[PDB]
Design a binder for these strands. Structure first.
Length: 81
DNA sequence: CGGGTTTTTGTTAAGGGCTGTATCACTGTTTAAGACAGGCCAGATC
């Protein structure tokens, strides 16, 4: 009810229960059973309102499996060679 | 001192997805250096 960095996982849960309600219903009725992409783009927009295309591109990269992730074939290459 | 409230918290059990750590089967394929005690030959000696 006060802040969120100190509010725990379920404290935040009870804080935005109704946020979750609306977002899940709208998502799984509009995108035909999906919440990942809609919450993804929601956070992208709500952070890009502060024109932080650096973090936007970084998050789109981690969603695209390229950057600070080392896809398992790469780590396997390193362990072998 | 309370006392309605917040503000956050504690709890239940099924099943799964994930992760971290323990466990498992398994591989080496005789020493060498030095101390001491017999025992038996082997020579020095009466």
């Amino acid at each position: 009810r006060q802040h969120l960095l100190s509010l725990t996982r379920r404290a935040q849960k009870h804080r935005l229960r109704e946020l979750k309600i609306q977002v899940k219903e709208f998502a799984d009725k509009e995108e035909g059973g999906d919440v990942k992409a809609v919450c993804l783009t929601l956070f992208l927009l709500a952070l890009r309102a502060r024109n932080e295309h650096r973090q936007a591109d970084e998050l789109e990269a981690i969603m695209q499996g390229r950057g600070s992730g080392l896809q398992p074939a790469v780590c396997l290459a390193i362990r072998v060679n």
